[PDB]
Write a protein that binds this ligand. Structure first.
Ligand SMILES: OCc1ccccc1O[C@@H]1O[C@H](CO)[C@@H](O)[C@H](O)[C@H]1O
Ligand SMILES: OCc1ccccc1O
Ligand SMILES: [Cl-]
Ligand SMILES: [Cl-]
Ligand code: NA
Length: 472
């Protein structure tokens, strides 16, 4: 039993638009912040790589559907490129080519018995909106609403699973370094908090929009996908446990407390620590933006499910480190990795499968067991089809998730592996491979070929169980 998927549980795979599509300026698509980063700042990216072509999924979407069908995916999570649909960011111009492209993909998926799950925003903000300041500028909440309306109107008759945002904890970091994630702005501890604030507002507007303009007719569900690492106390002390709770509240709670709790608002520890630190460093005003009571009420409850992106764990101990100002410094935890944990091709990603079960339990307890869809989980290497490390990563993480479900009563409802194919891994370019299908980036045809992990995941999807040879 502990090795069998619940009957209704949905299994599939995931991608993101900039990471796979290419066709960056084709047929009316406008520029986004990743076009800008990779074109203007190739020194920020391994190999000076760009997403200009990537997997060429703009042209090759039927091949993506073919491999999804071979895999036996029940669900395909993909994102929509804002600037492909609204080239100017604002809703004055709708690019019919972008409408047609996503309709073609959606229709191809449905004709092959695969359910679309659509992420509205996976990091590719139109440059015209970044030029207003991007996420730190609250005007983007209304712009996000208007973008979502175009998506619901055009696609919501066929798409019944939506995520507003993906991994805002990561993309807010684009406002915390001059050389980092797009738009590569150096406002740590100030502009990243403003970005989060706008994102939360935007998410809430999009959810209310669905309720007001679309839900009765379309009958779908709207969530948000939050990334979070498990943080294991470095020792059993109460103080180290306190530091790990700080980590959860500063990383997951920042987004989830306003939306998923009865109280709403930011976590108290976030408000209090940033207030104190801001005062101590001479600011008149806290660096943390505030919600009014009316805003707290508007934002809380804006969810039909919680998306989780889970990859790894850290060790946390009591203390403070990091630059002043920064969110890491504000969080009051000293973070490390255990040298004993298996490594990947990504410096930040160690293999700690039991951390997944711990995280799922933390979420269950903090948020009253919301329905949780694992929207990303996966592993990097540098290449190879005999990807034993990735196979082990998946089988162990899925075992841990199944224990969370069956032993711990966590309401996990679906899982999409990150990623369907090797793709453009942001600042790492094509150097880090997260796919279950390999892609030859030197071959203009970008053929997709299955790795061992794709074969094992197909076996899991077909049998609906962890195969005996992978059991403890
Ligand atoms: O790297 C950012 C990141 C860190 C920890 C948890 C989730 C994350 O974010 C996810 O990670 C994937 C692998 O890096 C990216 O390819 C996905 O686009 C991103 O959504
Ligand atoms: O987040 C990186 C970092 C910054 C300053 C000091 C120590 C650190 O690990
Ligand atoms: Cl101890
Ligand atoms: Cl066997
Ligand atoms: Na329209």
């Amino acid at each position: 039993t502990v090795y069998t998927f619940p009957d209704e549980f949905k299994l599939g795979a995931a991608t993101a638009s900039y990471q796979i599509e290419g066709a960056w300026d084709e047929n009316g698509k406008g520029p986004n912040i990743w076009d800008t980063l990779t074109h203007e700042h190739p020194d920020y990216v391994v190999d000076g790589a760009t997403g200009d072509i990537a997997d060429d999924s703009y042209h090759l979407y039927k091949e993506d559907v073919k491999i999804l069908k071979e895999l036996g995916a029940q669900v395909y999570r993909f994102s929509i490129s804002w600037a492909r649909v609204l080239p100017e960011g604002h809703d004055n111009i709708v690019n019919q080519d972008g409408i047609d492209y996503y309709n073609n993909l959606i229709n191809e998926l449905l004709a092959n018995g695969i359910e679309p799950m659509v992420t509205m925003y996976h990091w590719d903000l139109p440059q015209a909106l970044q030029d207003l300041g991007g996420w730190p500028n609250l005007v983007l909440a209304k712009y996000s609403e208007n973008y979502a309306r175009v998506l619901f109107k055009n696609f919501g008759d066929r798409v019944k699973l939506w995520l507003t945002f993906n991994s805002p904890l990561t993309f807010m970091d684009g406002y915390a370094s001059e050389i980092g994630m797009a738009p590569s702005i150096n406002t740590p501890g100030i502009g990243d908090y403003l970005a989060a604030h706008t994102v939360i507002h935007a998410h809430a507007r999009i959810y209310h929009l669905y309720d007001q303009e679309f839900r009765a007719e379309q009958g779908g569900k709207v969530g948000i996908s939050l990334n979070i690492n498990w943080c294991e106390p470095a020792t059993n002390s109460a103080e180290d446990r306190a530091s790990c709770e700080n980590y959860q509240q500063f990383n997951l709670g920042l987004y989830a407390h306003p939306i998923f709790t009865e109280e709403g608002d930011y976590p108290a520890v976030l408000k209090d620590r940033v207030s104190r630190n801001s005062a101590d460093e001479g600011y008149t005003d806290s660096r943390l933006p505030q919600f009014t009571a009316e805003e707290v009420e508007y934002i809380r409850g804006t969810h039909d499910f919680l998306g989780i992106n889970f990859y790894t764990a850290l060790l946390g101990k009591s203390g403070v480190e990091g630059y002043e100002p920064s969110r890491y410094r504000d969080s009051g935890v000293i973070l490390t990795q255990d040298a004993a944990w298996p490594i990947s091709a990504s410096s930040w990603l160690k293999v700690v499968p039991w951390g997944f079960r711990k995280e799922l339990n933390w979420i269950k307890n903090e948020y009253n067991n919301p329905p949780v869809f694992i929207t990303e989980n996966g592993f990097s290497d540098y290449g190879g089809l005999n990807d034993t490390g990735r196979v082990h990563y998946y089988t162990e993480h899925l075992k841990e998730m199944l224990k969370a479900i069956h032993e711990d009563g966590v309401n996990v409802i679906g899982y999409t592996a990150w990623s369907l194919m090797d793709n453009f891994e942001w600042l790492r370019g094509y150097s880090e491979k997260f796919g279950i299908y390999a892609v030859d980036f030197e071959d203009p045809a970008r053929p997709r070929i299955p790795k061992e992990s794709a074969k094992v995941l197909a076996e899991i999807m077909n049998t609906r169980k962890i195969p005996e040879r992978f059991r403890d």
